[model samples]
Target: AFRYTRSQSFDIFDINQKCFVLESPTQLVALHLQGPSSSQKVRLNIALYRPRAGTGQMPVALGIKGYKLYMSCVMSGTEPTLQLEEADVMRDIDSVELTRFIFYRLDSPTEGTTRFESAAFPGWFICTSLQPRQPVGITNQPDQVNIATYKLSG
Candidate 1:
């Protein structure tokens, strides 16, 4: 389990300690896990701004080393949903399997201030600066928010 502790001043947003299990189409059981947000004392909250009247969950297709991976993100109340595309995780391919999805609570000046952009595969996610307060879109730098990949099966 990855832990994110807040060293900077001020308390971040309250994190969600929800764990989703990945079962095969035949198997319809979800496993529970203690997320990093729960394990760590620091608070890392992800407040998305999603549109109403649209699908709450967005489906994403990723091509990793010729292997097609499907994934989706479920939006919370008033939170935006994140989707994965073939071009998002495009780069040196790594293992592709669904297990646990780790979400990082980025340190924004305020809530819902930062936005994401196209990203290179097998590297940190690329985010764009929707709010002028946060600049710098893409670089080789590590992203504040990240998800952990858990492989249940090959």
Candidate 2:
């Protein structure tokens, strides 16, 4: 007989700053910037969607899990913001693609503290502590902020 083990909890830790993890399944899916010291949390849902014709797959929307609201990266916008709204009411918005959640290590500057970039947003990366209040978002500006580096542990 074969025994199956559940996958362990994974954590995306902010390497540049201290004690911030890109956590889900706890508070609403957002960047936990305040560390464990504060009870306050930020929420941003990350999920992929597949089109009917299927041009492969893409990270289409962001919102809370149980909530009806979600937003997509506007391709036309100069600076695309992943904002949330009623996905159900919108014809373009749809259900989550559970199979498309992808994360991997990038070439690291430090040993153990591994850096990471998103497959969803090619040039952008999983940055931490951008805003003191809400500290998570992908950015192509690597020099402007320490947004492109991360340390992921499971």
Candidate 3:
């Protein structure tokens, strides 16, 4: 995922067969990873474009096996921020090791909303993993404070 404090464009890589498109005014996004092929790893890439001067903070929560991976960061002038949340889940046990890394951005911006671009990898074993489920909620933040549901088809 890339965070932006400016106006720029970005790209997402390794997109899974099933993707959940975020709606307008959509604050919370849920990603479901189900039915693996043969591969063992799954990855999600996010690109966020945030404007300069902000009030509160931008927070994102990544959940795997019901565990929350919360992250919050500020936006510099008009520069964007990129992040990659990699999850290496054990095949035998239903556990995963989640890691988030920040990339780079452009100059910067002073006003405007933030945009997000994401990609998902269901892994090679996607066929055996069944269909993954995702449910997301938002607090009293930029968008509405409601819950949105999403899923992937097999």
Candidate 4:
């Protein structure tokens, strides 16, 4: 019954309770928490379009302080990969080159977690690693690992 706004800042966390921290100015990786107060989580300003309302299948851009998460299209026979390209938090759904920036926020079977399927690549989803200290990536078979489902704190 929940819905995302046109523009919202969200902090993402994996089902394993790991959060994405700024590994570099242009990269983010999942890290397990150390101390209760020593938090270094990145707040992503996820932008969407207006006049677009639905329970599922929404185009969105995942952005942090100064970069956007771009799906660098891979060659044939494999899934697309993820990268933190230095760009704006593009809000216009009609913007050019959307295939690499837009992801369809879908509903996952896992409670309290959300699924982000690539808008360009139908089967690929934004996924994290099973173990700690790993960079965020995308996967075609999301259910195989608990990588696709994420908790988005808005």
Candidate 5:
């Protein structure tokens, strides 16, 4: 079962586990787990934004306030590190392609908690930033740290 604990927070639980879902207000998206396969992955959905009339062409674009700055990967070299940066969402085909690459493969390494491993980079876990404002990344080496663990709440 799941219930909202706050406007931006929720508590989800089942017979064996529980977790919290925190909305990314800045990103304007929600982290959703869908279907039985959801037990193995989490999906980040792009919330649709409607613009004022005559704002411009393509009335709507797939975006998030901080996605351009956060959802990105390095392409210049081997290992192709991924990290968050200060940038605008590029209105390009490449941008859309990369944005589609953000899903995380869920891994339960322990009881009552889960790890978000990168679907693009196998064996890498999505780690949190000490700097709260930064986007999460597929940091190597999963451990018994809170940064590598996530709780799922619907």
Candidate 6:
């Protein structure tokens, strides 16, 4: 049960330090920045999966621009929403359209931060909005805020 991780150009921060502002082409936000402007900040590249055996959730691919935006959850019945189209899901162990880009990583006692949950909306999480630019939404009331926790730059 050693968790898995994957990345290529990760730089998603939050802890009041903010970064991740791309409120367009589909939306996402978080603020507070200075210079070096690489379009402010936006570069996700998290692609990992490892959970065979009746599939217990933990498949990912939230990379941006290069393609992927987690489409309509529960297929429009409502709530499984993340719409920025780019076809072709990715995975194995009975993939099934990549389950709309499943994501279930949680391990953040505040080390480097990480906490996402949306095996197509299970406890509903993944956040952005505690008083910055605010937009990236989703929250079944995640605790302690800092924008539901996130920090990856490796």
Predicted structure with the largest TM-score when compared to the true one: 4
TM-score for each of the candidates: 0.19, 0.43, 0.18, 0.76, 0.37, 0.29
| Total backbone collisions for each predicted model | 8, 1, 35, 0, 1, 1
lDDT (CA) for every model shown?
0.25, 0.39, 0.23, 0.67, 0.37, 0.62
Q: How displaced is residue 12 in candidate 1, in Å?
A: 16
Candidate 4's clash total is 0
The candidates, ranked best first by TM-score, are 4, 2, 5, 6, 1, 3
Per-residue lDDT of 8 in model 5: 21
Report the lDDT tens digits of candidate 4 across residue range 60-88: 76767434553343334554677667665
CA lDDT for candidate 6:
0.62
Per lDDT, what order, best first? 4, 6, 2, 5, 1, 3
The candidate that achieves the highest lDDT relative to the unseen native structure: 4
- Give a tens-digit lDDT track for model 1, residues 1-154: 1222212222221122222322322111112334353322221122222112111122112222222222223233753233332332322222222211222222244343322222112233323222221221222233344222211111
The superposed Cα distance between candidate 5 and the true structure at residue 100, in angstroms, equals: 6.8
List model 2 lDDT by residue over 1-154, tens digit each.
1111122233444544444332433222234355356443223343433344112233333344344544332323666333334554222322233211232335454565644343334555445445443535556664265555555454
lDDT of 4: 0.67
Model 2 clash pairs are 29-44
lDDT of 5 by residue, 1-154 (tens): 1111111222332222322122342321123334454222222222222222111111112222323433444443677464444444333323334433333434354665645444345456555543332444456675434256655453
Mark the regions of model 2 whose C-alpha exceeds 4 Å error after superposition.
1-8, 19-76, 82-104, 107-110
Predicted candidate 3 versus true structure: per-residue lDDT over 19-137, tens digit per residue: 33232222223334346543222222222333221222332223221122222222236422222122332112111222121211211144222322111111100111113333232
